[PDB]
């Protein structure tokens, strides 16, 4: 069960995933303000 | 004592070669992950302009990507190569120069192997490897049915590694079709590509007829009914009066006013040439000033002006007709038909569709994405695939991919190894292992053992069953010509042959001298 | 602990007041160790010789 | 039956964030409201939704509130297809 | 052309916009514009 | 008002983002700025007020038209 | 978020991966050619008061000859 079948290399990838979700949802958070009638103009 | 200068940095003997094989270790290690269907996308990030790109391709990744190694420029030289002569394969390429200088680093350390006597391995172990896959392959074209069944096979391979391989069961009708309306004659300059946002991927379809992008005259209607295409050469324009090198002498101004008309009347009777053809469609390659404009409005004559140097052949053969410069004689030059010329929009800018043409000698492809990076790639992706299509009508000779070619030269190449007496022999066996590279990787990006599907498809060859493949969807053996994998013999006998001859240079290389950069 | 402030992050995104978060922890973590504490049995009834086992059997997995 | 089914899950949860984020705006609790939109939409069948003027749920159609087909099915199409080009992305490297 | 379902369709689809008060004479302006282009082809309907 | 916030955490801006009341804190603050000079020109006792283009130059103007003309205020809200 | 201070190199991949092995094959490949009768001596060169010393013994080599790797420190 371990020890057997193949073992993941280069994990960089996995964490670039992470880094590119968590900069998207970043910039999804600021625009979610202005969602509805009840949101806000975004002043630039 | 220092001869070369200052800022000289130079290596030599153990130090210069390590340099090509940590080169050569670096370049195939970014496009290895992007090696297979299930391999991945790199995005490459400019330094300047603040620009992204999302490319599959291993050649688009080395020419973007700035190296300072000399021996990595000959990775990304190959890739460019091998992009310019086929357009597929560049990242396997890449992939198998490097895996061939990996065995020989071994070669020179482990066994002691001079590295000329390796070159003279290659030499050996490449021309059975060329000699197993030639027999290996099928003569196609005998039979119109088979050789079109042969293209659909093709673009679902190479669309395989593309983020389209999930609607490339769709598009394989799309690529499939724009050769066989090229009636032998290979060009990519007949193709149109065009991006639209919105939408989805799989909502690309094929363009019956010829569609190019422009805008009808101010009074000009948008439909007309068997309208008469042609291409003019020949651009409405101040000329001057003929030769050029000349200006009017007016003695006094009763005869200016009249100057100026009679060059109003000099355009007025190139138009009353081209009115005697009886043409409902007029195509022009520059800016037409409005003066000529309105005297098609008159006549019923369509205007469709600022043609690209390639626009203006990708009309003229899906029309029949050809460019007319002169205008005297009516005879010459006879014109096509076009059923339908209305316009249609796709998006917010409006696309004027043809319909119902004499020849499909020229094609245009229309795409859909969410965003430019899809976009670009989807571009990129359709450009291997038509590549490779058209290179088939000429070259007719394929063969079966899925890591089974690489697995079938390399039985070739242990086979003469036995009867080669010395220590070359070992070098010829490191080809055969560099060749199972290739299948080995395809294993690793699908999340599957690579021992264990290498091993069962290696002994599985030697058993005398060469149609034994590699199937990432249920991780086991299959049969190539059961799931339709079919590669042209141009491909890989390109790929063998410009990653051994790549691997000879950095063999070769016993010092590096690296100038002062300016 | 980490796995506990992952969960609250997405529980903060959908309007929930941090204290109310922090005091629903608090009732939870009771529950699990009274759960436990009732599973679990006592060793302590039997005599050195078995006592001798349990801590050989606690100390390969510390190592 | 399957761990694509595991990710279905997910995708239903995921279109959430549009109604809990009026209430969030609105200042109105997204929880309370859920639950009562939960309970409505399972016998009505459509029309039951979020009303920035009652501050509540009601009957969108009744309120006139209404949009078109074309806005809701490009919205989700363009975003699974943004999604499939992030994930695809293994590295970031440098270029000039 | 229904003056009910486009009218009340495009107030609502302003929604956060600062037009929203001003949507009293606004709406039948946005539907009115397109009704002067009418075809059963269902036509993008430039707005040049 | 009070420490200025953090700079672009994981939101990757090159330039400057300030988020909830602090946004309208300055913005109030935008229009008080400008509102004192006005203010105390309002009415018939009002007092003329004198600006100078540091050229040796001043400009006497009592209403707020050609005062917030000539002051240049770089608040996107002023 | 970056939690760790400014000046602090860390690698949680493959890079780390390829410098810990690389970093014991330069300590190999340095005691590689004085292994054996046949093997030749190697030569240090002090930093300070230019003393050098000459020396087979690999004990001496590896302390001597200053090395910021952790896999070459083991
Ligand atoms: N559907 C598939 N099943 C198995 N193997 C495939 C499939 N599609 C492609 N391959 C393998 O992936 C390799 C790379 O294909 P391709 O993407 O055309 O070249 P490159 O990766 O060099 O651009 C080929 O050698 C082929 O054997
Ligand atoms: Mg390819
Ligand atoms: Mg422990
Ligand atoms: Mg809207």
């Known amino acids: 069960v371990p020890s057997n079948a193949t073992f993941k290399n280069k994990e960089k990838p996995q964490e670039v995933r992470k880094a590119n979700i968590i900069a998207a949802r970043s910039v999804a958070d600021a625009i979610r303000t202005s969602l509805g009638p009840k949101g806000m103009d975004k002043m630039i | 004592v220092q001869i070369f200068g200052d800022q000289v940095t130079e290596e030599r003997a153990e130090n210069a070669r390590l340099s090509a094989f940590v080169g050569a270790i670096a370049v195939g290690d970014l496009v290895k992950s992007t090696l297979g269907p299930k391999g991945m996308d790199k995005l490459l990030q400019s330094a300047s302009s603040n620009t992204c790109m999302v490319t599959n391709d291993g050649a688009t990744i080395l020419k973007s990507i700035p190296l300072d190694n000399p021996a990595a420029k000959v990775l990304v030289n190959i890739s460019k190569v091998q992009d310019d002569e086929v357009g597929d394969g560049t990242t396997s390429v890449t992939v198998l120069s490097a895996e061939l200088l990996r065995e020989a680093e071994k070669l020179i350390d482990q066994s002691k192997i001079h590295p000329q006597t390796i070159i003279e391995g290659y030499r050996l172990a490449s021309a059975a490897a060329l000699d197993a896959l030639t027999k290996a392959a099928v003569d196609n074209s005998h039979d119109k049915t088979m050789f079109r069944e042969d293209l659909i096979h093709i673009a679902k391979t190479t669309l395989s590694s593309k983020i389209l391989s999930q609607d490339k069961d769709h598009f394989a009708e799309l690529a499939t079709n724009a050769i066989l309306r090229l009636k032998g004659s290979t060009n990519l300059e007949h193709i149109q590509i065009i991006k639209i946002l919105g939408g989805k991927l799989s909502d690309s379809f094929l363009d019956e007829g010829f569609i190019l992008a422009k805008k009808f005259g101010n009074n000009q209607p948008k439909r007309i009914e068997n309208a008469k295409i042609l291409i003019a050469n020949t651009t409405l324009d101040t000329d001057k009066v003929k030769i050029f090198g000349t200006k009017f002498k007016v003695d006094s101004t009763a005869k200016l006013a009249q100057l100026e008309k009679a060059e109003r009347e000099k355009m007025k009777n190139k138009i009353a040439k081209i009115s005697k053809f009886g043409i409902n469609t007029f195509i022009n390659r520059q800016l037409i000033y409005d003066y000529p404009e309105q005297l098609f409005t008159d006549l019923g004559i369509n205007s469709i002006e600022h043609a690209d140097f390639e626009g203006v052949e990708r009309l003229a053969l899906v029309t029949g007709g050809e460019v007319v410069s002169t205008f005297d004689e009516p005879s010459k030059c006879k014109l096509g038909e076009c059923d339908v010329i209305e316009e249609i929009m796709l998006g917010e800018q409006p696309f004027l569709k043809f319909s119902g043409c004499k020849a499909g000698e020229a094609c245009t492809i229309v795409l859909r994405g969410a965003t430019d990076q899809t976009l670009d790639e989807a571009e990129r992706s359709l450009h291997d695939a038509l590549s490779v299509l058209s290179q088939t009508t000429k070259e007719t000779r394929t063969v079966l991919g899925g890591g089974c070619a690489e697995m079938v030269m390399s039985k070739a190449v242990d086979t003469e190894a036995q009867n080669i007496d010395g220590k070359k022999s070992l070098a010829v066996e490191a080809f055969a292992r560099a060749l199972r590279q290739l299948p080995t990787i395809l294993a690793d990006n699908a999340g599957f053992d690579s021992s264990e599907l290498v091993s069962k498809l290696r002994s599985s060859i030697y058993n005398g069953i060469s149609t034994s493949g590699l199937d990432l969807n249920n991780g086991t053996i299959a049969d190539m010509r059961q799931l339709g994998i079919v590669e042209s013999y141009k491909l890989k006998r390109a790929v063998v042959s410009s990653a051994s001859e790549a691997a000879e240079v950095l063999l070769r290389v016993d010092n590096i001298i690296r100038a002062r950069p300016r | 602990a980490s796995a506990l402030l992952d969960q609250a992050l997405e529980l903060i995104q959908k309007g929930i007041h941090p204290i109310k978060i922090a005091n629903g922890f608090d009732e939870a973590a009771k529950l699990a160790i009274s759960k436990l504490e009732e599973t679990c049995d006592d060793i302590s009834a039997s005599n050195d010789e078995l006592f001798r086992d349990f801590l050989l059997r606690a100390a390969k997995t510390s190592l | ?96 | 052309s229904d003056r009910e379902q486009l009218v009340r369709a495009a107030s609502t689809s302003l929604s956060s916009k600062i037009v929203s008060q001003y949507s009293s004479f606004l709406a039948p302006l946005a539907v009115d514009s397109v009704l002067k282009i009418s075809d059963e082809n269902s036509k993008n309907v430039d707005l040049n | 008002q009070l420490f200025n916030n953090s700079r672009s955490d994981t939101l990757f801006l090159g330039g400057e983002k300030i988020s909830g009341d602090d946004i309208r804190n300055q913005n109030v603050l935008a229009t008080m700025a400008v509102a004192n000079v006005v203010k105390s020109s309002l009415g018939p006792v009002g007092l003329d007020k004198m600006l100078v283009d540091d050229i040796g130059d001043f400009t006497v103007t009592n209403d707020g038209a050609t005062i917030l003309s000539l002051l240049d205020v770089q608040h996107p809200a002023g």
């Open chain 4, 1 to 96: 039956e399957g761990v694509q089914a595991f990710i279905w899950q997910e995708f239903a949860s995921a279109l959430e964030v549009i109604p809990t984020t009026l209430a969030e705006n609105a200042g109105l609790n997204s929880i309370k409201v859920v639950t009562e939109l939960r309970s409505k939409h399972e016998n009505g069948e459509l029309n039951d939704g979020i009303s920035v003027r009652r501050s509540g749920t009601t009957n969108t159609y009744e309120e006139h509130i209404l949009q078109p087909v074309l806005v809701s099915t490009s919205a989700i199409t363009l975003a699974s297809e943004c999604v499939k080009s992030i994930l695809r992305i293994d590295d970031i490297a440098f270029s000039r």
